Design a protein around this nucleic acid. Structure first.
Length: 114
RNA sequence: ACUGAAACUGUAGUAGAACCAAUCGGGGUCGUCAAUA
């Protein structure tokens, strides 16, 4: 198939990780209102990612001590610009179907998330 | 069409009486962290 879209390149965050993912915008798409609730949740979650390892990042560790062959995930080393959910920022959305509608629970920077 | 003279603003009087630098706090202890394939 031929597709187009964007690449959600994070980094080699895990030792078994081989691939980045790219968002096949060429096809089906669904738009959902961005509430202020999801905005604060993102900022709080991304603050958590960036603050938790601040000591490890500042002392110059290239990746988390507990996972070998791996480097900081994009959201951790990214700036506070990442912490603000600005126009065209890429995400994973945690979603379910209810009342016949796609409810969105959270926005997450990675597949298996904090 | 003759300058008055002479005279300590001084004497007595404790910036002091009362007031707590003090109240609370085991030098203690477990699972997280990373995200894909």
């Amino acid at each position: 198939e031929q597709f187009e879209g964007f690449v959600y390149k994070t980094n080699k965050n895990i030792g078994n990780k081989h691939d980045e993912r790219v968002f096949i915008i060429d096809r089906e798409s669904i738009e959902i209102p961005l509430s202020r609730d999801l905005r604060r949740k993102w900022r709080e979650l991304i603050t958590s990612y960036q603050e938790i390892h601040k000591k490890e990042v500042d002392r110059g560790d290239t990746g988390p001590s507990a996972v070998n062959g791996a480097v900081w995930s994009r959201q951790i080393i990214a700036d506070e610009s990442e912490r603000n959910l600005s126009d065209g920022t890429l995400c994973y959305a945690h979603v379910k179907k209810e009342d016949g509608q796609y409810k969105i629970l959270n926005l997450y920077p990675v597949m298996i998330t904090r």
